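Last lecture ended with a question: if I hand you only a sequence, what can you say about the shape of the protein? Today we answer it with a concrete record. The protein is Afadin. Below, first the input exactly as provided, then the predicted structure, then a couple of comments.
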Amino acid sequence: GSSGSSGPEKLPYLVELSPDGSDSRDKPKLYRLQLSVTEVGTEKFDDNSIQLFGPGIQPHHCDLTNMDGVVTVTPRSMDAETYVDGQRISETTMLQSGMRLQFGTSHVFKFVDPSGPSSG
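The predicted structure:
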């Protein structure tokens, strides 16, 4: 119906992955996509926003909005190349745990949902 979700201890995060989409031998950065829209890029929109720095990155790349344990990548700029698992998007594209996110063909990240794939 219409109630909402409550689980700050199980929010979706983006674990930066290698430039090939592999798990390095070190600890990659993590960005817990907390409730509310999360603007990405090099610009600082929100206090707890995603600040990525790379050659070919923009200020307003995309905004991660968690709506009911659901997150969808929203490219604010067309120039900002956003590929979800090696697949470019052209609008709000639902994100799933495991799916990769290539930002400017350099900053690759892996989105994971600690909430759970609908029960489990």
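Comments.
1. The two ends are 21 Å apart (CA to CA).
2. The chain has one domain: 1-120.
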